[PDB]
Amino acid sequence: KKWLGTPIEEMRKMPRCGIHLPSLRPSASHTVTVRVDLLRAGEVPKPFPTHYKDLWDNKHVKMPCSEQNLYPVTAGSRWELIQTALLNKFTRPQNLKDAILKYNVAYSKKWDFTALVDFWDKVLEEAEAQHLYQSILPDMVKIALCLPNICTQPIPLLKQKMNHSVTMSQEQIASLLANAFFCTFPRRNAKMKSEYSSYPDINFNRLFEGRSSRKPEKLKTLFCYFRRVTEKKPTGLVTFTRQSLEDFPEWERCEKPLTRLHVTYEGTIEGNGRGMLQVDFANRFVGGGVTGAGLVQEEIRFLINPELIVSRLFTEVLDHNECLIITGTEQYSEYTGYAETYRWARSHEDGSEKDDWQRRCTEIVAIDALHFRRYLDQFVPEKVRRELNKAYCGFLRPGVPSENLSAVATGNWGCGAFGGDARLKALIQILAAAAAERDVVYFTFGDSELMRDIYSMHTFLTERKLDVGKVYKLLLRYYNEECRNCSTPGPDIKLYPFIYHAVES
Ligand SMILES: Nc1ncnc2c1ncn2[C@@H]1O[C@H](COP(=O)(O)OP(=O)(O)OC[C@H]2NC[C@H](O)[C@@H]2O)[C@@H](O)[C@H]1O
């Protein structure tokens, strides 16, 4: 049997479980960059304000089209330099390289474009390369240079400790990412960098470097997205929300019961978690190394839903008590394989429903697990409380009643690159969801024994009526009784057998 637990169709999904969405209006906590009054279905949103307003300070994104974006000639407008550079024709890779370097002269010998030249000549066919520079690259420049006219409102930086949302259009995002592709964002490339050292990289320069055989598949995935939005302008909105909690459960005395579980070894979070809160196994610098090296769960999601990539422009590094909730992004590509075997399969027509704010019903939460430098560290109670607290922040929607919350679609969070133990992390998530009072759909990603063990454990704890606080205390018991006074890196018994034994006595 390929799944276990509650049947998947008894789990709450959006937009069916949701409360009627109230009128979309700006707020001290909500930035909205489009004309709400003119917002209609299938209609490309209008910007608000109508004409470019500029801020060049330490609270908002520094835009390439700002008058204060200067370069040494006397002080010259780098924006005029960007327009000059890109309005040239592209016949070969060198002409895009030389164009991008005109306004990034400091990095003229730190930036390699080997992956791009190979993609242009070797990987793509002639009719594919010809279509790239005669249609796709020109149409990318048009939307990039229209940034002033499309992004009229300053975009606020989502800093540590801020509970704030920014609601933006897909066309606006299209423009920003087009600018990112051409590496136009100022003050965002420094290594010794001061101001944006706590933000992820935004400019795409590293997408052209290296001799990795997966660089072309990243380009294909992004050029699939760019080709799409260029041809037919997208009409949706995307909300990015930074959540930062101060009051977490007192886990040891939490009387809340466990909730329902559906767990399967077939399918994926994105493929089979439609209308559910889909977890992104993030880096605290959101997006990971999507714009560079790195091609695992987060990056892949960031590439097939590239409108997530723009979050890197305004999202400060996540502290332990924080997550980034992105609602509205569209999936543009399909893929095969994973990491070194990842490949772009084809375009994907997203058939998701949209809400009263014209966002696609796709909620993604970025929560960073801890990167454990050795296996035994994660069982230390403070590391357990941290991961619980991170997941709990990822799942909790205060302001929404629990019966109006979808299930969470998640998986082996923290247990790939970050060396976590899936059984420990599964239980952590199940406990987090229970505190947040939501159901869990778990994808073990091809692992059947893990599915059985997770189900059996959930069932055992449910039928003995043990609450969050009792299970938490068992985890603290596991460390003290079997991990603390431990001879070699491994203890004499694993977590699950310990729980079974300790509860049965
Ligand atoms: N699409 C999908 N669905 C469900 N499960 C998946 C999927 N893709 C991968 N996985 C499973 O999740 C596991 C964890 O993936 P990984 O990307 O290693 O997550 P980590 O949290 O360990 O890694 C965090 C780091 N990696 C990329 C980020 O930028 C972080 O720096 C991985 O081993 C797979 O078993």
Residue numbers in the entry: 444 to 516, 524 to 955
Provide the authors' original text about this structure:
Reversal of PARylation is predominantly carried out by poly(ADP-ribose) glycohydrolase (PARG) in nucleus and cytosol, whereas ADP-ribosylhydrolase 3 (ARH3) may play a role in mitochondrial PAR degradation. PARG comprises an N-terminal regulatory/targeting domain and a C-terminal catalytic domain. The mouse PARG catalytic domain has a bean-shaped structure, with the active site in a deep cleft in the middle on the abdominal side.
Among proposed PARG inhibitors, adenosine 5′-diphosphate-(hydroxymethyl)-pyrrolidinediol (ADP-HPD), an analogue of ADPr, is probably the most potent and best studied one, with an IC50 of about 120 nM. Under a new crystallization condition, we obtained a second crystal form (space group P21212) successfully soaked in ADPr and ADP-HPD, and solved the complex structures by molecular replacement. ADPr or ADP-HPD binds to the active site cleft of mPARG. The signature catalytic loop (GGGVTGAGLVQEE) interacts with the ribose ring of ADPr or the pyrrolidine ring of the ADP-HPD. Residue Glu748 forms a hydrogen bond with the 2″-OH, while the key catalytic residue Glu749 side chain carboxyl group is very close to the 1′-OH of the ADPr or the C1″ of the ADP-HPD. The second conserved glycine rich loop (GCGAFGGD) interacts with the diphosphate group of the ADPr or ADP-HPD. Upon binding, the second conserved glycine rich loop (GCGAFGGD) undergoes a major conformational change to tightly interact with the ADP-HPD. The side chain dihedral angle of Phe868 rotates about 90° to form a close contact with the pyrrolidine ring. The side chain dihedral angle of Phe895 rotates about 120° to form parallel π stacking interactions with the adenine ring and subsequently close the deep pocket for the adenine ring. Our PARG structure in complex with ADPr and ADP-HPD suggests that mouse PARG uses a very similar mechanism.
